[model samples]
Target: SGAIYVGNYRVVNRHLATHNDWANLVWEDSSRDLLVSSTTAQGCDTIARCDCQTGVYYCSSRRKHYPVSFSKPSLIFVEASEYYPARYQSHLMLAVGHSEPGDCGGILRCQHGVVGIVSTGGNGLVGFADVRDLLWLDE
Candidate 1:
């Protein structure tokens, strides 16, 4: 598997971790929902899940790297905006056409968090989250 994975965190009844302080950052107060206290089996790995593209297990990070172009080491994070969209869900992805080598490979990957929940029809690209992440080079 690559560095990316897909995982839908089930929000539980517990309060979020005390360490999470999105409220301190005015630029990211909208991203507070990303600090989710997921419901695990309890006593197992503190992690939650991963996507099909990267097939990685993310405990603190939400991403799944899919090698869109297999010839090189190009990848994508098909997840959320790294910020939760309160009051609803949307489908989102980050796209980067270039690799770290500055190759011609165009890159497109998901950001983080629930940009949008999977639609029953499987085509939920209509919704878009405003609080998204940066499209950086994969290291």
Candidate 2:
């Protein structure tokens, strides 16, 4: 039952867990269909989705949304190493480049759909928990 303002957008924090480093936020935009991600609609050319090996992804920092800036199209990949904590080990993680430490809670999305949620990052690398693994949400 809480909401936060990100520039002109209002996102509602719907779900959170202490054992994990991810949360679900609902964008207040109601004009667009929520299932837009499910279909193959065009207009995702600006930022490409992350590939298994390497691809560009996009994310914005909630703390740094005043002027609205996105981290440079950063190269990202699935994280399988011990860089993140054990709690995040259970979920699929993407290691992104050029992300700031304050970028946590930012939605990591691509041309297709949401990829992950910014969990923690620093030193030129940020970790995002895959959105599919966040099973706490309801349909």
Candidate 3:
């Protein structure tokens, strides 16, 4: 697994990693939980989780859950000017959509709209999955 920046308020766990200095710039010392870790997996495949609107997700760089619109990629801006504004991120966007392979009656089409986990400032990353991507981690 490589690295993906996630800003949220959580207890420092194995799913999260941290740096020494400037790395902490984006996050605050208290309240916020900023970590750099790979996608949600032990392997370094950078597989997208079984969530999101497009049945797709991105961990900075990945072969799957790949972005579709490269020229005019969607941009999510960050805004945390309320309260402590601790664990949070700028914005999140999606370029295209995706669907689990062999899923949805084994159809080879992407029916999933597009899932986006945006930052709710201190509330952390609010997620919404648009499609059902069966996740059999044993694979």
Candidate 4:
């Protein structure tokens, strides 16, 4: 029902056997992985929770879930700054990074201690320079 809203997510990534980048995510939401229900939306995790009054359950995010009968809509609501709990390690979670400066040159999320996605030609550098450059993209 909302265009945007705030909530919490706990998901993580594992070393992919076939891909150069990260692999399949295993949510550490509970000690036993069998009980929790997971839903995938966009590139994020959607966990379903039961609501007593609504008479139905929903993914925790503020975004609304439409029935599959409707055509699929474009994915939205993800940003570079958010973090979800990591399933692999208790200390980490999946973090997002934008295409580094140019096309993909500088190390992404270098200072933030997060993974990065550099563009094809992007140097992926972030520093005082990004403040001057990405400054525009921040808002």
Which candidate gets the maximum lDDT versus the true structure? Answer: 2
Ranking by lDDT: 2, 3, 1, 4
TM-score on alpha carbons, each prediction: 0.20, 0.38, 0.22, 0.15
- Better candidate by TM-score, 2 or 4: 2
The reply for model 4, stretches above 4 Å from the true place, is 1-107, 122-139
Sliding window of 10 residues with minimal summed lDDT for model 4:
125-134
Instruction: Give all candidates' CA lDDT scores.
Output: 0.22, 0.36, 0.27, 0.19
Model 2: per-residue Cα lDDT over 11-63, one tens digit each: 22122222221222232112110111111222321222444323334445433
lDDT value, residue 87 of candidate 2: 30
What are the per-residue Cα lDDT tens digits for candidate 3 across 34-125?
Answer: 22222332442222443333333443222443333211112334344333342332223323344321111111113432222212212222
lDDT of 1 by residue, 20-137 (tens): 2233311212222222222223321122122423211111112333332111111223244222322332223322222221111111233333221111111211111111232211
Model 3 misplaced regions, further than 4 Å? 1-45, 48-53, 56-73, 81-91, 94-139
The predicted structure with the larger TM-score, 3 or 4, is 3
Error of 4 at 37 (Å): 18
1 or 4: which has the higher TM-score? 1
- After superposing candidate 1, which stretches have Cα over 4 Å from the reference? 1-23, 29-32, 35-52, 59-86, 91-132, 135-139
Q: Model 3 TM-score?
A: 0.22
